[PDB]
Design a binder for this molecule. Sequence first.
Ligand SMILES: [Mg+2]
Ligand SMILES: [Mg+2]
Ligand SMILES: [Mg+2]
Ligand SMILES: [Mg+2]
Ligand SMILES: [Mg+2]
Ligand SMILES: [Mg+2]
Ligand SMILES: [Mg+2]
Ligand SMILES: [Mg+2]
Lengths: 253, 258, 254, 258
Amino acid sequence: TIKQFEGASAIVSGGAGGLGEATVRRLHADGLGVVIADLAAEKGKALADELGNRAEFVSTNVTSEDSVLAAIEAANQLGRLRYAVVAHGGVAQRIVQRDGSPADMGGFTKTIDLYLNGTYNVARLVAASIAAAEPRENGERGALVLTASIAGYEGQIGQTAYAAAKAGVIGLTIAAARDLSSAGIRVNTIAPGTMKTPIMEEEALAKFAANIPFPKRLGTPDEFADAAAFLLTNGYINGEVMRLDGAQRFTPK
Amino acid sequence: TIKQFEGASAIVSGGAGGLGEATVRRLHADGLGVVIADLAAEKGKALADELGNRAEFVSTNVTSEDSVLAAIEAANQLGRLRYAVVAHGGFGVAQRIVQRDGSPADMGGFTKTIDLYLNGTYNVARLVAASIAAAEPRENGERGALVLTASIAGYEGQIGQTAYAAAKAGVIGLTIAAARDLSSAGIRVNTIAPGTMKTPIMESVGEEALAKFAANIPFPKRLGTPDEFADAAAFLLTNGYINGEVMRLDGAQRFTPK
Amino acid sequence: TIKQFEGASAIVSGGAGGLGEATVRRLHADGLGVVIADLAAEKGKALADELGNRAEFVSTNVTSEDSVLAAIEAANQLGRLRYAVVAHGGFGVAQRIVQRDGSPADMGGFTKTIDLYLNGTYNVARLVAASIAAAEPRENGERGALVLTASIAGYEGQIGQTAYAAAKAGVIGLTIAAARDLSSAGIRVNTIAPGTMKTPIMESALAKFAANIPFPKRLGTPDEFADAAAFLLTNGYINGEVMRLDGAQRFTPK
Amino acid sequence: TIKQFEGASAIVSGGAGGLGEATVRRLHADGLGVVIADLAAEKGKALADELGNRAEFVSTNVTSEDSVLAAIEAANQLGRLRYAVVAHGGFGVAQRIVQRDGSPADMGGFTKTIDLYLNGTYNVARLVAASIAAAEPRENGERGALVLTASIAGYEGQIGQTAYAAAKAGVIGLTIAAARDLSSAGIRVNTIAPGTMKTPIMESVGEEALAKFAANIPFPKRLGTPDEFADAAAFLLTNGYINGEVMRLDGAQRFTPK
Ligand SMILES: [Mg+2]
Ligand SMILES: [Mg+2]
Ligand SMILES: [Mg+2]
Ligand SMILES: [Mg+2]
Ligand SMILES: [Mg+2]
Ligand SMILES: [Mg+2]
Ligand SMILES: [Mg+2]
Ligand SMILES: [Mg+2]
């Protein structure tokens, strides 16, 4: 168990599959108690049961205060909650559709609610719990990793809602780091490119791969988890957005 | 009247005061019919009356489809709607993520800020873009142009202002995505990210705090004027090649944490 | 003549043709005395001759102090030098970091590109800024303003064009630093980062270029560049900013 | 020995001291053969001797092709050269673009800074990349990786430091271009942009002056350590999907004008 993680626990939103699952497995392997915070109950309990004692599934709706507070209470029974990775994941619509109609507002607000409001709701509640922990000798109480997307910098046709939500998370990063600096809680963000998430898991894989300089493939969940673990453990990285994208820059289509 | 604006109309959200008022005055002087889209009824009506028959006040809640659709119908009586400047202003909720007593920031305060500055911007943009997309293009292929308003808080958010920072960062990121979306319609989309600007709401902080703000600003060593904002907005509407861009308008200021 | 420009003069590097020429024409029409600072002598002189006695051509190598100083002297005979647009164009060396045959990029090619686009920009800026700093400020406190030219290659550099990407990114980063440095003199500094523009080389497969350009689906015009440069010179609050002028293009690798 | 580092070697420019030294020690600890490429011969030799037979000192001027080629030959006696961290630097004198007496900054000061930080970086990169491009790829297609060092000054350059800002911005912009250029060879290219770091230059800095830096750094409220830089470099060399990226390593600091 790595020194920073001694006595500690973590929450991973979207922890039952994909990028979140890989993050859970990495943090668990590195010695943290981990709460799998997700709505996918069969997958989440299977993962928690596989990993054993230091992994617990909690059915968690990221936009509900009471649901996230229950995840926090669960994490504080595995150790002192000091870390969180907000990795919850998940159709395109142009702002003016091909028939001339505007984008449906409901679709926009649902995307903002899940990816931006959900990220803030998890961050504020987890941060308030971490703020109450004893600092380590270096002054740090803990750290958060948020998940954006390079769509927040280079949003694509039909993806204005996702681009706006993920840009919101990108801009949140430095503001939250500044806010939480008095508590010694670092905040950083991973902006992935095109990742091999469950929906992606070999013909149409070449179409994405084609715009990706190197490696010429989708990024793996384990690569994401490695990035998240680095942001939790490096003591000077703060208020930063890390692009994790094989040097891809999104084209319009 | 400049060729771009002949026969055309524009909607300015937040048009009744501050940055929006200056934009209305500028676009009206440049030959556009203008709809002052605002909830400030007395100020808005007064401005519309002062400017005359090519300026109309429409009471507009930017988060309401019905209300924005009414502003669009009014604009289309003043010419063909080709332009909008989304300039509704004010502050976000002032609260730290973790507050002094250890409690978290109020989620309501955050979502209200996102609703007004991000969702409100998207709602105005989607409805106005749909109208403009139905217009005939000019010889150069362009049907119209939108200017959204962000803030440099979107890049350099401050302590206690995570809600505003998130909302304005959302607008910043929306810019290139919307420009890409609307490119098949020939509608340009750009955004102004103001620094600290001289508006009534800003000046409510009192002279001592304003003096502090002016000190962080390299040159000019003062708050930006509404007329400077209006001039940038007009430029984004008229220059034919600027698209998907965010323009910082800030006297070279970079926000410090506090 | 707009009041910002009354009694004032300007230098445009690369002014003989392309983006620079459109800029010279615009600034001259707006009432400034203009020096065309360029090495293309016949083209530059013909432009100065066409525009008349408020336009002068000075053969200028942007990396030579004495050469730029002579352009400044000429400018100060046409009015008080308050503005410059650094618009000297062309491409960098076209070469991969590691070439087809396994050999590294030629260092001379890289350094030539850096010298022309980055060192050349700084040399013009420092000398023009020194001159402008000695001018009397206007009532608003402003002595003058500079516009630098970068490229979106500085953000999204391309295969075979690392030299140009590095030089132009240097210009991008210089912008805020120079604005802060010159803030005490009341000299604003901003930069235009063009996308794919219809420069003289493009006068002679345009659709291949325009295919990655969202809207307008064409190359940017010199007049659109000049309009952006005029705005950066006249708007009183824009400072330390880089303006992308690219029809929403984002450069692909190739 | 880290799996990616099996049988491999690395060059670290500026490897004799400060950020480079910590990087040498971390890479060596992780199982790489390391070449300390630096002009500081006495420090460099002492470090190579302390670390043992998997560390070698080579006196290297980063702007000399033959000098850098000698470092690459040395690296290839220690393993297959697959990695480099370009962490060299130098002493700088502040100079404003227009000085107090009205004179312009000395061009020589600007070109020397560009030569060391930008040209020097490119010279090391092209020669190291050429050698790495000849190595057999791993099964994942990767031949190796480079880490360049910039500075947050390349985003937020400071008064009197225009030359350093321009040079470091050049390195920043080079990152994505070099990653694209080298993608067909399977050589990743990333960059660290440090904030204010505890390097030998800071050893004698006063308690008041340390407080001044700390007051602008949100958290941790102190200078970054060389080991923290080294840890970032090791991550960029090992993570298989990070490419063409600039990593700010700065305690959330944003540089103010002064
Ligand atoms: Mg998941
Ligand atoms: Mg279990
Ligand atoms: Mg208003
Ligand atoms: Mg009226
Ligand atoms: Mg030219
Ligand atoms: Mg003449
Ligand atoms: Mg060193
Ligand atoms: Mg040894």
